[PDB]
Amino acid sequence: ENYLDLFSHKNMKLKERVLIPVKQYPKFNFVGKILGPQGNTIKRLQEETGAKISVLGKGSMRDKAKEEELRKGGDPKYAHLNMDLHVFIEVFGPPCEAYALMAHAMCEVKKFLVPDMM
Amino acid sequence: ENYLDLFSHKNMKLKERVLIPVKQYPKFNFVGKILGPQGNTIKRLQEETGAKISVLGKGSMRDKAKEEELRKGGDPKYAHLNMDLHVFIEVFGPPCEAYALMAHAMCEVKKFLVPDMM
Ligand SMILES: [Cl-]
Ligand SMILES: [Cl-]
Ligand SMILES: [Cl-]
Ligand SMILES: [Cl-]
């Protein structure tokens, strides 16, 4: 019920929402650096880690105007635009794989979100 | 609230209860193989993975008599003896570390619990 069964036919899901730390680094352009030109960084990042990774929340499109318009329209696909800016990592698999994927993704995302580390 | 903050002063905890699959391998002595002589396997295993790892549930002491006695005494430390046989993995750390620890532990524990794999 709350146990993991290694022989289960269902994959497990792990999901996390990691705050982009704008408080600690007020002028650093996290959205630009994560997405990359054309979104190639985030594309590479998902390919290398095997996770779904998304930037969401106020500022995720950088374009205060387009964000305003899409919130205002009330469409639920855009409900996230009200949330604090954050990275949403989602993985699926049997336990061993799912944890390994999340671990990989989480550690790569840390590299972007603590940009002055080491 | 539900977000991970990478700058949080609190460590995160991950915990999992992985069923020992007695159904799939009815005669295999999982408890003996995980603990080892004197409990040195489980000791090594925690040292190598950095996780707390425990065998709990009916059969975890192999000694149907001692288990009977400790359940009967009603002490809550032994409430687990009523549960299905299982491995309880517990880790703590900031996100990246915590996931990496859980991933490592979970994958090592899989090796014991799917003993005919590869
Ligand atoms: Cl349970
Ligand atoms: Cl599924
Ligand atoms: Cl890793
Ligand atoms: Cl939330």
Ligand SMILES: [Cl-]
């Ligand atoms: Cl703590």
Ligand SMILES: [Cl-]
């Ligand atoms: Cl691993």
Ligand SMILES: [Li+]
């Ligand atoms: Li910033």
Ligand SMILES: [Li+]
């Ligand atoms: Li067994």
